[PDB]
Structure formats: C-alpha cells, structure tokens
C-alpha cells in the first residue's frame, strides 16, 4: 500500500505583542504523531501518537532543534514578506508551509511536496518533478531566484529521496498495528419523517480509517443530486473519521433508495437500505 510522511506549519505574527506563534505538526498518512507549539515556557517537539514515544532522547532533541530552526526562519520570512508586499508594521499575517514524501506500492518515492502560502494564498511550490519552483506572483519570483541560487530544490529533493522515506518506513513498522490497518466504516441508515408524506433517510459511515471515502444516494440506481445534504468527512477524535448523507424521499418509496459506500476497509462497495 501507499503511504505519506508530512509536516505542516503555521506561523502567525503578533506585531507589538512579542514573538510570532509557531505551531507545527507531523502526520503519517492520516495520523498525527508529533507537534511543536512555541507558546509553551520551554517548547519541545512532542509525541502525539503512542508508536513514536519509543524514540530516544536524541530523536526528540534533534526534532526540537529542527523546529526551532524552522521557527527562526519562519520569523525571518514573515518580516521579509511584509516588506515584499509593502504592508504595515501593525497587522498580523500568516505564513503556512507543508512538505513531505509519498512512498509508493513498489517501495520507492512516488511523489514529493514542498508548498507555502502567505495570508491563506498560494505563494511558492516545488514542481511535481522536484527540480524547479512555481511562483504565484512577483514576490514569490524573488524567493524563487534566491532558492535557485542556493540550489535548494536539489537539497530538498535529497531529503525526500533519502531520509524522508527512511523515517516513513520506520514509523510504518513501529506503528504497524494501527497505521497499517484499514478500519471499515460501521454503516447504518436512519429514518425521520419530515411530513405526512415525506421522510429523511440518513446514511451513516462511522469509525473508518483512513479518511478517504465515498458515500452517495441512488434512487432506482440513479445518482441523487436533489433534496440531499452531505457533510464532509470529519474526525471522530479517536483517530477515526465520520461521514453522512441524507436524502428526503416520498413516504412509502424508501426502498427505491440505496446508499453506496466505498472505502479501503470494504472489500466490496456497500449497498445499503433503510431496514424498518
């Protein structure tokens, strides 16, 4: 199966009120396993999954050092960006970044990522070919020239091709009892009258992992797009996810409606009906 190691970061300036806030997190697939939050007294990179707790003191010291170096650099970048865009000294601004590697089914680098945003807008991204940059505007073009001068794309690619994958492999092994398990959705359909001639069927998918899922309603085998509401997949808070979709139907015609669920944990797509 395919897997990913990803780090995400948010840096928020607080002009006049001290240092920016830095919150960084790391994920393997859809599971968070580390964090760094600068607004602690002595901030440390910390475990947020059980299977990473076994890493020794040198691991946590090195990751705390990397977090602090990144924060120093994010701080510099927030200042630089304020200048690039000729913005006031007074407003708060946000820098976000993400980076990581995908391990393919053949055990090799499938994809690499390195992307940044300023105040919620795409700023600069590493090209899918991992050789060059794509800049969103003239400010990012300045960054691009600097990163080209220091051959940063090649240096980051070396991280992606080596250590990123080495660490991902290690996490996947150490955490294999949870990371490498596809938990299927528990599914059910509820029924709630809307009027004396209509009812709502709500199709539930609960407790599934990973997050990727599809859930649709059909009437007589036909995809339903009217009289319907779907919620986006959302975390349950126990490491699993939830999703539901509801459709309003004519009373007495419930059995014409079918809910269709597909997930890695389901060997076949599920077809479900209300069961009175």
């Amino acid at each position: 199966g395919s897997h990913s190691l990803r780090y995400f970061g948010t840096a928020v300036s607080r002009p006049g009120r001290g240092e920016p806030r830095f919150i960084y997190v790391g994920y393997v697939d859809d599971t968070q396993f580390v964090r760094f939050d600068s607004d602690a007294a002595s901030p440390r990179t910390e475990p947020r999954a059980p299977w990473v707790e076994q890493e020794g003191p040198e691991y946590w010291e090195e990751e705390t050092r990397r977090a602090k170096a990144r924060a120093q650099t994010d701080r510099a970048d927030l200042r630089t960006l304020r200048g690039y865009y000729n913005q006031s000294e007074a407003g708060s601004h946000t820098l976000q970044w993400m980076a990581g590697c995908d391990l393919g089914p053949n055990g090799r680098l499938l994809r690499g990522y390195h992307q940044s945003a300023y105040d919620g807008k795409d700023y600069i991204a590493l090209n899918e070919d991992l050789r060059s940059w794509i800049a969103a505007d003239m400010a990012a073009q300045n960054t691009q020239r600097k990163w080209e001068a220091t051959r940063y794309a090649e240096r980051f690619r070396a991280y992606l091709e080596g250590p990123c994958l080495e660490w991902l492999r290690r996490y996947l092994e150490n955490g294999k009892e949870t990371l490498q398990h596809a938990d299927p959705p528990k599914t059910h359909v509820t029924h709630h009258p809307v009027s004396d001639h209509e009812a709502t069927l709500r199709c539930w998918a609960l407790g599934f992992y990973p997050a990727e899922i599809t859930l649709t309603w059909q009437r007589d085998g036909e995809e339903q797009t009217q009289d319907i509401e779907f919620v986006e997949t959302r975390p349950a808070g126990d490491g699993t996810f939830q999703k539901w979709g509801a459709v309003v139907v004519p009373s007495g015609e419930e059995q014409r409606y079918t809910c269709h669920v597909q997930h890695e944990g389901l060997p076949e797509p599920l077809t479900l009906r209300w069961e009175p």
Partner: peptide
C-alpha cells in the same frame, strides 16, 4: 526553506 532557507529563507523566503
């Protein structure tokens, strides 16, 4: 990165 190494500085934006």
């Amino acid at each position: 990165g190494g500085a934006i």
